[PDB]
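Sequence design from tokenized structure. All designs in this work follow the same two-part layout: the structure record, then the generated sequence. An example of the structure record is given first.
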């Protein structure tokens, strides 16, 4: 009831009534409420935020302050006692490729980003949080538990800064704190093009009217494009090897270079766009740059939606797919297309799917070079291994023929992430992605596990044995009740991820509910969904149905043997076929001649 229209937004945004393209910012999608789904607004609250003080202070902020009559355990302790494991044998997913992991991260990055508010120019509390571990305002450091190895080697904390929040971006008053989504809620390739007109154009090739995306001129991949460098300094991709002096790449999403396989997939995504703007030229040489760009962008956005919705989600959601995501019925303007705050946690299930190492594979899909396989941690913010060691193709082969990690209740998150995560301002390959996830739940005012079980029409355990029966695991359940002392207090990230996988999928009931709703809402709520009548011609929509990730690979690399189904486990040379066995993206229906 308070501040019904609050915010310090992207202000002067008006709308074209019959514009055939999405805005960059995702604005003007919904007509009755054109800011719905747009970047740089609040994340949607499916449930009222729960803060220590009901307003903004995170649970665990204040010693003496309990949640339902109990102290919440330290995030790094939940990490250590529950999330970690030593043995990487037996952890691989026998029927999911490493690409399965990778698409997840892509899709996710297109949907949401809640950037930390550090927001200082020449600032003392930057290094002050890291150095001295002094909690305060936006500094909310992850403290070590007693007898934690990182005490011996790193200090007293890992640093952590609270997420951005709307309206008063510096202080706060009388409505609960709400974190920002810096990207568009729609599945619109915002990670290739940007979610700011400012970025969107700094990414374009405006030097020649072919509507191409700007490429790299310093370096090449057998005459294939690289994303341009991001010439901002301090660059972390330079920080990881000062000798190579190779910076991070520049993409529509800022996180592209966090790891080499993410960078890799961003590169396939750039080329597909350029490849598409070239073909449109040949068939429509009368069209200008802008339209070529837009029609390419339009084509790529559909491509991501099909792949995600036809190929990705059925094998994440499995049995719960149809329940939550009925086949398409058309655009409904009453659907909230906004990504919700809990989804930015639910989708972090992908964290448990990341394995310990990355391989590079030659044309016989054999260990490319002597150091073919590398540990994941040496590949954070590492572009130098792409430009100075083989291109994209060997890695794109790694994605096809190696396996995602399997989630496992006794082996959750690998140490490459749980202990050896590199973050940009800091220095050591020494952080804990699991600790962070949990600190973030609290920072974001997340309701606890039972609220969400409640929300999803599932039983709400109150006892050890109850939890045992739901998790189908005595020991896990025990360690959790020992830490959290009531399921009501269990952080949703751990809680949802602890539940056994549903038949034919890769998440448990609760997550499939959360994920399920969200994806349903983003498709049903999108005036520009590829299948929404009048978005494409029926002719255009029949060429669209035949895209594949395999074909994306074939059209954009020099790989000539691919699986038919890229997300399932594929073994070479058995499950591999020559590229010409594979449907293409016919673009005949896009030719629009003068008469
Ligand atoms: C090796 C691969 C990955 C690395 C190195 C990585 C790292 C990170 C980091 C550092 C964050 C920020 C956490 C925070 O500040 O609170 C994050 C957030 C996140 N991760 Fe990952 N991640 C990886 C893979 C994935 C995958 C495969 C998925 C999904 C399947 C995923 C889903 C998410 C989501 C949804 C967020 C929150 C984004 C937001 O809304 O701000 N991540 N990841
Ligand atoms: C930094 O990157 C450089 C490449 O620019 C790596 O140096 C190369 O190492 C391999 C291993 O034998 C050689 O094939 C090259 O001849 C080396 N080049 C140069 C210029 O030294 C180096 O290993 C990287 N170091 C780190 C710590 O990442
Ligand atoms: C823009 O396109 C022209 C014409 O194809 C090309 O020569 C040039 O390298 C491009 N510039 C950038 C920055 O991508
Ligand atoms: C792999 O994944 C899907 C998901 O159930 C399924 O259609 C297929 O049977 C599985 N393949 C194998 C070899 O188990
Ligand atoms: N799911 C991701 C979260 C964060 C990052 C990341 O830490 N940065 C840092 C700079 N750019 C991305 C990457 C992926
Ligand atoms: Ca988006």
């Amino acid at each position: 009831s308070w501040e019904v229209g609050c915010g310090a937004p992207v202000p002067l945004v008006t709308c074209d009534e019959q514009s055939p393209y999405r805005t960059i910012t995702g604005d003007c999608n919904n007509r009755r409420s054109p800011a719905l789904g747009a970047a740089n607004r609040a994340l949607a609250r499916w449930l009222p935020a729960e803060y220590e003080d009901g307003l903004a202070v995170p649970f665990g902020w204040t010693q003496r302050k309990t949640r339902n009559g109990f102290r919440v355990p330290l995030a790094r302790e939940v990490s250590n006692k529950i999330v970690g494991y030593l043995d990487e044998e037996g952890v691989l997913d026998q029927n999911r490729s490493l690409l399965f992991m990778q698409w997840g991260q892509i899709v996710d990055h297109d949907l949401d980003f809640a950037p930390e508010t550090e927001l200082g120019s020449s600032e003392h509390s930057k290094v002050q949080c890291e150095e001295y571990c002094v909690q305060g305002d936006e500094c909310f450091p992850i403290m070590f538990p007693k007898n934690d190895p990182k005490l011996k080697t790193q200090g007293k904390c890992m640093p952590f800064f609270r997420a951005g929040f709307v309206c008063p971006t510096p202080p706060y008053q009388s409505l609960a704190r709400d974190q920002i989504n810096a990207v568009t809620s729609f599945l619109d390739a915002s990670l290739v093009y940007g979610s700011e007109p400012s970025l969107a154009s700094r990414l374009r090739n405006l030097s020649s009217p072919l509507g191409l995306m700007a490429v790299n001129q310093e370096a090449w991949d057998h005459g294939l494009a690289y994303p341009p460098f991001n010439n901002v300094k301090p660059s972390p991709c330079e920080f990881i090897n000062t000798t190579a002096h190779v910076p991070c790449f520049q993409a529509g999403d800022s996180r592209a270079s966090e790891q080499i396989l993410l960078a890799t997939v961003h590169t396939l995504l750039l080329r597909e766009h350029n490849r598409l703007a070239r073909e449109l030229k040949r068939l429509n040489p009368h069209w200008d740059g802008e339209m070529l760009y837009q029609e390419a962008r339009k084509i790529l956005g559909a491509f991501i939606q099909i792949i995600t919705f036809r190929d990705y989600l059925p094998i994440v959601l499995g049995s719960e797919m149809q329940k939550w995501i009925p086949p398409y019925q058309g655009y409904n303007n009453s659907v909230d297309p906004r990504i919700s705050n809990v989804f930015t946690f639910a989708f972090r299930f992908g964290h448990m799917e990341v394995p310990s190492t990355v391989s590079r594979l030659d044309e016989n899909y054999q260990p490319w070079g002597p150091e073919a396989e590398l540990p994941l941690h040496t590949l954070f913010f590492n572009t130098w291994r792409i430009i100075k060691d083989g291109g994209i193709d060997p890695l794109v082969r790694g994605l096809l023929a190696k396996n995602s990690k399997l989630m496992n209740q006794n082996k959750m998150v690998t140490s490459e992430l749980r202990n050896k995560l590199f973050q940009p301002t800091h220095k050591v390959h020494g952080f804990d992605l699991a600790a962070i996830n949990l600190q973030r739940c609290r920072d974001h005012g997340m309701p606890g596990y039972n609220s969400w079980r409640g929300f999803c029409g599932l039983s709400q355990p109150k006892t050890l044995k109850g939890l045992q029966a739901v998790l189908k695991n005595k020991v896990l359940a025990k360690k959790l009740l020992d830490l959290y002392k009531t399921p009501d207090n269990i952080d949703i990230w751990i809680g949802g991820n602890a539940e056994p996988m549903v038949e034919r999928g890769r998440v448990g009931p609760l997550l499939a509910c959360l994920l399920g709703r969200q994806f349903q809402q983003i498709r049903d709520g999108d005036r520009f969904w590829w299948e929404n009548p009048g978005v494409f011609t029926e002719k255009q929509r029949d060429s669209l149905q035949k895209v594949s990730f395999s074909r994306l690979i074939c059209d954009n690399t020099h790989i000539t043997k691919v699986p038919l189904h890229a997300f399932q486990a594929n073994n070479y040379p058995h499950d591999f076929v020559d590229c010409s066995a594979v449907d293409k993206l016919d673009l005949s229906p896009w030719a629009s001649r003068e008469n």
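Residues 1-595 form a domain with the Myeloperoxidase, subunit C fold (CATH 1.10.640.10). We note this feature because it recurs in several other targets discussed in the main text.
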